[PDB]
Amino acid sequence: DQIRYSIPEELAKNSIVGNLARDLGLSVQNLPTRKLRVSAEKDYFTVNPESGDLLVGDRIDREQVCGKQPQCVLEFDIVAEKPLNIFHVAVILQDVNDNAPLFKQSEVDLNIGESTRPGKAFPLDPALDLDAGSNSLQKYYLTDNEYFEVTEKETPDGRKYPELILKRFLDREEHNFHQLVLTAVDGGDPPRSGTTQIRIQVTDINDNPPMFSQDVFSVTLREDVPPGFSVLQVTATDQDEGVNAEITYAFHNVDEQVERIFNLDKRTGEITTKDNLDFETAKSYTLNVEAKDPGDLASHCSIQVKILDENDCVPEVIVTSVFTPLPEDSPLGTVIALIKTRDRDSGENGDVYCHVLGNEGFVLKSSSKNYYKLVTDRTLDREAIPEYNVTIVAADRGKPPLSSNVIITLHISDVNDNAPVFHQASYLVHVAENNPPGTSIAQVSASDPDLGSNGLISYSIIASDLEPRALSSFVSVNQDSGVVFAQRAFDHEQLRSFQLTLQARDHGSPTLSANVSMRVLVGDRN
Amino acid sequence: QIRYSIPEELAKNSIVGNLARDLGLSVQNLPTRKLRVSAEKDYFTVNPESGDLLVGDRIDREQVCGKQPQCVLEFDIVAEKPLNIFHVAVILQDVNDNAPLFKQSEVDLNIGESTRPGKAFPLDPALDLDAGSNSLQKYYLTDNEYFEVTEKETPDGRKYPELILKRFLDREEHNFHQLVLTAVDGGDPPRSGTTQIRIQVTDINDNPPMFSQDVFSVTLREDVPPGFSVLQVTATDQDEGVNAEITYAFHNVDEQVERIFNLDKRTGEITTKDNLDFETAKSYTLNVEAKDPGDLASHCSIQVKILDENDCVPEVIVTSVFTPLPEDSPLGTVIALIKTRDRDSGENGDVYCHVLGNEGFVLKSSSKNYYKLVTDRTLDREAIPEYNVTIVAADRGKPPLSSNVIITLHISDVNDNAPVFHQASYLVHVAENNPPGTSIAQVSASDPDLGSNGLISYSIIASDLEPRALSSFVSVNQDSGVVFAQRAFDHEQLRSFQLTLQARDHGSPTLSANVSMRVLVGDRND
Ligand SMILES: *[C@@H]1O[C@H](CO[C@@H]2O[C@@H](C)[C@@H](O)[C@@H](O)[C@@H]2O)[C@@H](O[C@@H]2O[C@H](CO)[C@@H](O[C@@H]3O[C@H](CO)[C@@H](O)[C@H](O)[C@@H]3O)[C@H](O)[C@H]2NC(C)=O)[C@H](O)[C@H]1NC(C)=O
Ligand SMILES: *[C@@H]1O[C@H](CO)[C@@H](O)[C@H](O)[C@H]1NC(C)=O
Ligand SMILES: *[C@@H]1O[C@H](CO)[C@@H](O)[C@H](O)[C@H]1NC(C)=O
Ligand SMILES: *[C@@H]1O[C@H](CO)[C@@H](O)[C@H](O)[C@H]1NC(C)=O
Ligand SMILES: *[C@H]1O[C@H](CO)[C@@H](O)[C@H](O)[C@@H]1O
Ligand SMILES: *[C@H]1O[C@H](CO)[C@@H](O)[C@H](O)[C@@H]1O
Ligand SMILES: *[C@H]1O[C@H](CO)[C@@H](O)[C@H](O)[C@@H]1O
Ligand SMILES: *[C@H]1O[C@H](CO)[C@@H](O)[C@H](O)[C@@H]1O
Ligand SMILES: *[C@H]1O[C@H](CO)[C@@H](O)[C@H](O)[C@@H]1O
Ligand SMILES: *[C@H]1O[C@H](CO)[C@@H](O)[C@H](O)[C@@H]1O
Ligand SMILES: *[C@H]1O[C@H](CO)[C@@H](O)[C@H](O)[C@@H]1O
Ligand SMILES: *[C@H]1O[C@H](CO)[C@@H](O)[C@H](O)[C@@H]1O
Ligand SMILES: *[C@H]1O[C@H](CO)[C@@H](O)[C@H](O)[C@@H]1O
Ligand SMILES: *[C@H]1O[C@H](CO)[C@@H](O)[C@H](O)[C@@H]1O
Ligand SMILES: *[C@H]1O[C@H](CO)[C@@H](O)[C@H](O)[C@@H]1O
Ligand SMILES: [Ca+2]
Ligand SMILES: [Ca+2]
Ligand SMILES: [Ca+2]
Ligand SMILES: [Ca+2]
Ligand SMILES: [Ca+2]
Ligand SMILES: [Ca+2]
Ligand SMILES: [Ca+2]
Ligand SMILES: [Ca+2]
Ligand SMILES: [Ca+2]
Ligand SMILES: [Ca+2]
Ligand SMILES: [Ca+2]
Numbered sequence A: 001d002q003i004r005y006s007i008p009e010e011l012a013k014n015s016i017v018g019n020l021a022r023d024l025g026l027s028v029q030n031l032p033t034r035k036l037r038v039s040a041e042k043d044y045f046t047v048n049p050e051s052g053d054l055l056v057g058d059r060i061d062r063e064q065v066c067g068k069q070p071q072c073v074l075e076f077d078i079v080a081e082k083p084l085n086i087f088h089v090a091v092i093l094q095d096v097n098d099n100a101p102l103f104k105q106s107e108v109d110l111n112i113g114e115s116t117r118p119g120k121a122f123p124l125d126p127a128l129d130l131d132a133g134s135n136s137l138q139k140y141y142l143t144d145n146e147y148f149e150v151t152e153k154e155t156p157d158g159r160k161y162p163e164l165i166l167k168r169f170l171d172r173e174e175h176n177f178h179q180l181v182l183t184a185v186d187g188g189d190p191p192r193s194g195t196t197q198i199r200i201q202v203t204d205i206n207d208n209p210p211m212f213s214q215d216v217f218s219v220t221l222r223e224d225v226p227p228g229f230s231v232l233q234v235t236a237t238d239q240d241e242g243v244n245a246e247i248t249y250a251f252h253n254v255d256e257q258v259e260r261i262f263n264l265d266k267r268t269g270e271i272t273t274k275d276n277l278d279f280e281t282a283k284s285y286t287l288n289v290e291a292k293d294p295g296d297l298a299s300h301c302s303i304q305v306k307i308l309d310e311n312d313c314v315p316e317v318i319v320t321s322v323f324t325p326l327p328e329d330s331p332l333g334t335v336i337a338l339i340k341t342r343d344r345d346s347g348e349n350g351d352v353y354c355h356v357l358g359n360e361g362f363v364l365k366s367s368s369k370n371y372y373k374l375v376t377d378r379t380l381d382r383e384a385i386p387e388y389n390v391t392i393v394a395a396d397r398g399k400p401p402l403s404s405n406v407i408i409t410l411h412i413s414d415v416n417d418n419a420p421v422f423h424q425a426s427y428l429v430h431v432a433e434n435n436p437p438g439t440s441i442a443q444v445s446a447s448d449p450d451l452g453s454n455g456l457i458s459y460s461i462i463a464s465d466l467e468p469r470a471l472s473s474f475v476s477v478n479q480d481s482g483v484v485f486a487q488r489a490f491d492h493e494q495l496r497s498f499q500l501t502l503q504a505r506d507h508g509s510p511t512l513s514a515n516v517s518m519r520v521l522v523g524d525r526n
Numbered sequence B: 001q002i003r004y005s006i007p008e009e010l011a012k013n014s015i016v017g018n019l020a021r022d023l024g025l026s027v028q029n030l031p032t033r034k035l036r037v038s039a040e041k042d043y044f045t046v047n048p049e050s051g052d053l054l055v056g057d058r059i060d061r062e063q064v065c066g067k068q069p070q071c072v073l074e075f076d077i078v079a080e081k082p083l084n085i086f087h088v089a090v091i092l093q094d095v096n097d098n099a100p101l102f103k104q105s106e107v108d109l110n111i112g113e114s115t116r117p118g119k120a121f122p123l124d125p126a127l128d129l130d131a132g133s134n135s136l137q138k139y140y141l142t143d144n145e146y147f148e149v150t151e152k153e154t155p156d157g158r159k160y161p162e163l164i165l166k167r168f169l170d171r172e173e174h175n176f177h178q179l180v181l182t183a184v185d186g187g188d189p190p191r192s193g194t195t196q197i198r199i200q201v202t203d204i205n206d207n208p209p210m211f212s213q214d215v216f217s218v219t220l221r222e223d224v225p226p227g228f229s230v231l232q233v234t235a236t237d238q239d240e241g242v243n244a245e246i247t248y249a250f251h252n253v254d255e256q257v258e259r260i261f262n263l264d265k266r267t268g269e270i271t272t273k274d275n276l277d278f279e280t281a282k283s284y285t286l287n288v289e290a291k292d293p294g295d296l297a298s299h300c301s302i303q304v305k306i307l308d309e310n311d312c313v314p315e316v317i318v319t320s321v322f323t324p325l326p327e328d329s330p331l332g333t334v335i336a337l338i339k340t341r342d343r344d345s346g347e348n349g350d351v352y353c354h355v356l357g358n359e360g361f362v363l364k365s366s367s368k369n370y371y372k373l374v375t376d377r378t379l380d381r382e383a384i385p386e387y388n389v390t391i392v393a394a395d396r397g398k399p400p401l402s403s404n405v406i407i408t409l410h411i412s413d414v415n416d417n418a419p420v421f422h423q424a425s426y427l428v429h430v431a432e433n434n435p436p437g438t439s440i441a442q443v444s445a446s447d448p449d450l451g452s453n454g455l456i457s458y459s460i461i462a463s464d465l466e467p468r469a470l471s472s473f474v475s476v477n478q479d480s481g482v483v484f485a486q487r488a489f490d491h492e493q494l495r496s497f498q499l500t501l502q503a504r505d506h507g508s509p510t511l512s513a514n515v516s517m518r519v520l521v522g523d524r525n526d
């Protein structure tokens, strides 16, 4: 059972709310009789007795009293004495738009993932406008931009708050961060705004792979670089940050020897040899390097290594045929030996010239490159020079040159080209009469410089002035020793001297001979 | 040089050609000149009797020539006595006997989930040791929606097969792929070589954590201790590894939510770290955010409601009391004004009052929660001057709680009792010739009132004697009530006289009582 009065809030103190003396039917003289008083938990109002009307007391701030409540009603009692009575009074106060909507924080900073799907919603803390009705918050709206949208969400249960609807994919390598201005507006005359700034810092995720500076590189090396030689350092650039920017390098899809010879450090990306190179084994290597982050995004490159040749192989002289023993009557230009040269190098380091040392009558003639023949230049002789030590030298054209020599041993075989020569130009022997038959009266001798059969000497009597049927009856000759024998006792009174033609013969093809004349003189006795 | 041409992989003793007829030699002299072959390897052997060239060891063209399109073998023939050398070259024509072949039958690649389309992946090529059209000519691949196959030629001329990607991968849809790569040459019949490529997609942090449902509902009784298991919340990330470990935390919350509740960052489990009260806050809106290391997050809210428990005792307040209370107070007169306050809500905060005992006071409720203590009995201070009215209030919750107060009432006196004489009439005998100024009688009266209202003062208002001589006969002491004789009495003159006294109270207004007194003058002899 109450009466109701209406005023605006924040009203001036001691402003009349209304006269209760008229509404409660109390004479102005009947009233001071009565203690008129206000009973309330917090004294927002008081009454002057002599006045008989209601008076505003303390600060009547609606927002600290009713809060959000749609209608604001202050219930309090009024006490009167003689007779004792309690009257009930409640006042309605109208809302004043004296509070503007304001966000809790001046700046809010969000971390939004780079790969957040579009349309995803991010709830935002709502502003606080303590007024009620139309004077409360009505419209959120955000900075016009292309990346983000704002909408006011109200769940069917009751609570409401604004949220960000993402418009498109983010990309920290395009924009590291954005800053936007959100405005909250209430709906009365005149509207009151409150702004806040949102800074969104995009966080890195893995979407860019390491990339090499070029598709292909090139380096060259001498084939004598020691193990550990820095060949080439490769690097890749990853546009991400954090662990999604760590780069690992590795050999992949390389021949076995390519991986065995070289060595690539995973973290640094530098390539150094681990063993000796050899141009004769591999003229060049090709290299493929894989660079990848932990997210297995990769890019690959190819480095081509071209080795350069060095003069490190000695030329070799191969001799494939030789003429031994060599007959001394061999004509000019006969081919004695077959010569080839092999140098595993390349270019001028493998180009070889061949010479024969000395001038003993042997020269090299070249039919074609690396092919030679060792011919005779002058006539030969075994009794002069029986044996030859022929040195052939091959030399390359590298700087400095590398040489090699070989020694061929030629033996000269005997040809029957020397006739036997008698020790004396003629022979003359003195045999005394009445000599014993079958004794040594003389001994011819010859000499032959040839070897073996071509130097074996046989002696024979070819002619004499005596009766041919009686020659053997007089003297004879030993074919093996040359000693001459008498086969009958000589008689001076019958014949004093006789003539003999002795012959020296060898055993060759053909046989060579020589004639000597021996005269036998028979001494005289009785 | 003599040029020939034969197919590879011919059987031994096969005739290549008759060099006796081709060199220009004579078959009569072929036995004397050893015809022989000098060469690096014993691929061939001539017969000196027949003078022809036989194949020796197997001549595998791919074991000699390799990459060279046309392959020639150059070897020498030595003669002897006469001694010469002859140059021959045999062309090895290619027989398609080698098929394309891969180093590994199965290759395993790791491709990140976010390789942009068109990214080329260079694969290990196939080896076709043949040359010409019989060498490798094209690559083919299983028809799928994700990968195409190409063959790229570096300007150097090295050819390699690279894969091209046409559609974004997704391991949450297809963890890995199995493909078939074939290599085809250009002979008839064409020989093919296959390999199986198992491509494995690597996890990339592309999916955010997500909750079962956006809003949860729980209720808590307000008397739960600190540390009560409120709720456990979990989220599921569709990724793997470090990309799928979750961190939960509060997000845009009131200070009180952070002071009362403790949420495990690792478990998503909320408990309370303080005591709750229903009268302070009836509900709590919690906002939880679950985020992965990539700052991808989803948000849910837990709307907690609080249950009221009866813990506030009801309070009785006596706004005003009416004491002292006049004993002439009519019925239904208001004594004390009462109000009731219980901070609980519902039946726990619904208070009702009643008076203990029965002594003439009843509680009439003008409105809900307000009482007037009125009288239903006429009071009398001479009977009961003090009252100790005990008022009790209780609530209708389970279990209920009550409280009492003791009002003390003092009863004000009112002059509501006139004095009464202890006797109805007075008859007094006086002897004759009594001394003037002697006590003849004494009257008495009583008044139960308090103080001046109970003070009695006597007087003689009237008598039958002439009023001028009344002062000469009798008198009364107003304090003691004694009736004295003011003269000597003579029986022969007057035998008896009557009298009319009054007993009066002193409080205003005065209450009086009249009494009659008869005086008989006794008779002596004079
Ligand atoms: C109305 O009630 C009052 C107060 O009663 C108080 O509360 C009750 C629940 C009981 O527990 C009472 O014992 C308690 O005092 C009564 O007044 C009280 O009366 C008693 C007895 O007459 C007084 O006791 C005296 O106390 C003093 C010391 O203060 C001693 O020296 C005395 O020897 C004697 O023990 C008590 O003081 C008094 N209290 C007050 C505040 O006056 C009252 O009698 C009662 N009236 C009726 C009609 O019931
Ligand atoms: C040839 O050389 C060998 C080896 O030293 C030697 O024994 C021989 O006497 C030499 N002959 C000539 C003729 O120089
Ligand atoms: C030696 O004598 C024989 C026989 O009379 C003769 O044929 C020859 O010419 C002579 N001279 C030589 C040198 O042999
Ligand atoms: C007592 O008597 C006097 C005179 O006779 C009279 O006026 C008075 O009213 C009487 N008392 C009462 C209580 O009536
Ligand atoms: C917000 O916007 C209002 C108009 O809607 C302005 O009046 C105010 O100053 C604030 O900028
Ligand atoms: C909201 O935003 C504006 C800038 O748009 C500030 O000037 C203002 O103080 C509040 O931070
Ligand atoms: C190793 O070191 C050499 C210099 O010594 C560099 O030229 C090379 O690129 C690699 O870094
Ligand atoms: C090159 O030098 C060597 C010695 O180092 C000789 O043996 C060779 O004959 C040529 O002169
Ligand atoms: C035999 O003996 C004689 C000596 O009487 C020599 O003169 C002769 O030459 C042969 O030796
Ligand atoms: C590879 O492909 C060829 C046809 O190009 C077939 O002949 C062979 O059997 C293999 O399938
Ligand atoms: C290549 O593919 C074939 C089937 O097409 C297999 O049989 C072979 O072993 C290789 O995996
Ligand atoms: C503690 O235990 C309760 C059940 O007793 C759960 O509901 C809560 O989520 C927490 O795990
Ligand atoms: C009021 O009533 C409650 C029970 O409702 C009691 O516990 C209390 O002592 C008082 O009598
Ligand atoms: C005065 O005294 C006499 C006795 O002396 C009493 O009889 C009389 O009633 C009054 O008290
Ligand atoms: C009359 O006198 C008696 C004593 O005799 C008192 O008790 C009474 O109150 C009245 O005054
Ligand atoms: Ca205000
Ligand atoms: Ca306001
Ligand atoms: Ca406002
Ligand atoms: Ca990016
Ligand atoms: Ca990366
Ligand atoms: Ca990135
Ligand atoms: Ca070398
Ligand atoms: Ca070399
Ligand atoms: Ca060399
Ligand atoms: Ca000679
Ligand atoms: Ca000779």
Ligand SMILES: [Ca+2]
Binding pocket: A416, A417, A418, A419, A420, A448, A449, A450, A454, A455, A506, A508, A512
């Ligand atoms: Ca000779």
Ligand SMILES: [Ca+2]
Binding pocket: B008, B009, B060, B061, B062, B095, B097, B098
């Ligand atoms: Ca073959």
Ligand SMILES: [Ca+2]
Binding pocket: B008, B061, B062, B094, B095, B096, B097, B098, B129, B130
């Ligand atoms: Ca072949």
Ligand SMILES: [Ca+2]
Binding pocket: B096, B097, B098, B099, B100, B128, B130, B134, B135, B136, B185, B191
């Ligand atoms: Ca083939």
Ligand SMILES: [Ca+2]
Binding pocket: B170, B171, B172, B206, B207
């Ligand atoms: Ca995915």
Ligand SMILES: [Ca+2]
Binding pocket: B113, B171, B172, B203, B204, B205, B206, B207, B238, B239
């Ligand atoms: Ca993923």
Ligand SMILES: [Ca+2]
Binding pocket: B205, B206, B207, B208, B209, B237, B238, B239, B243, B244, B292, B296
């Ligand atoms: Ca994830």
Ligand SMILES: [Ca+2]
Binding pocket: B222, B277, B278, B279, B309, B311, B312
């Ligand atoms: Ca409580």
Ligand SMILES: [Ca+2]
Binding pocket: B278, B279, B308, B309, B310, B311, B312, B343, B344, B345, B348
């Ligand atoms: Ca409670």
Ligand SMILES: [Ca+2]
Binding pocket: B310, B311, B312, B313, B314, B342, B343, B344, B348, B349, B395, B397, B401
């Ligand atoms: Ca309660």
Ligand SMILES: [Ca+2]
Binding pocket: B327, B380, B381, B382, B416, B417
């Ligand atoms: Ca009374």
Ligand SMILES: [Ca+2]
Binding pocket: B327, B381, B382, B413, B414, B415, B416, B417, B448, B449, B450
């Ligand atoms: Ca009284």
Ligand SMILES: [Ca+2]
Binding pocket: B415, B416, B417, B418, B419, B447, B449, B453, B454, B505, B507, B511
């Ligand atoms: Ca009285």
Ligand SMILES: [Ca+2]
Binding pocket: B432, B491, B492, B523, B524, B525, B526
């Ligand atoms: Ca008398």
Ligand SMILES: [Ca+2]
Binding pocket: B490, B491, B492, B493, B526
């Ligand atoms: Ca008398």
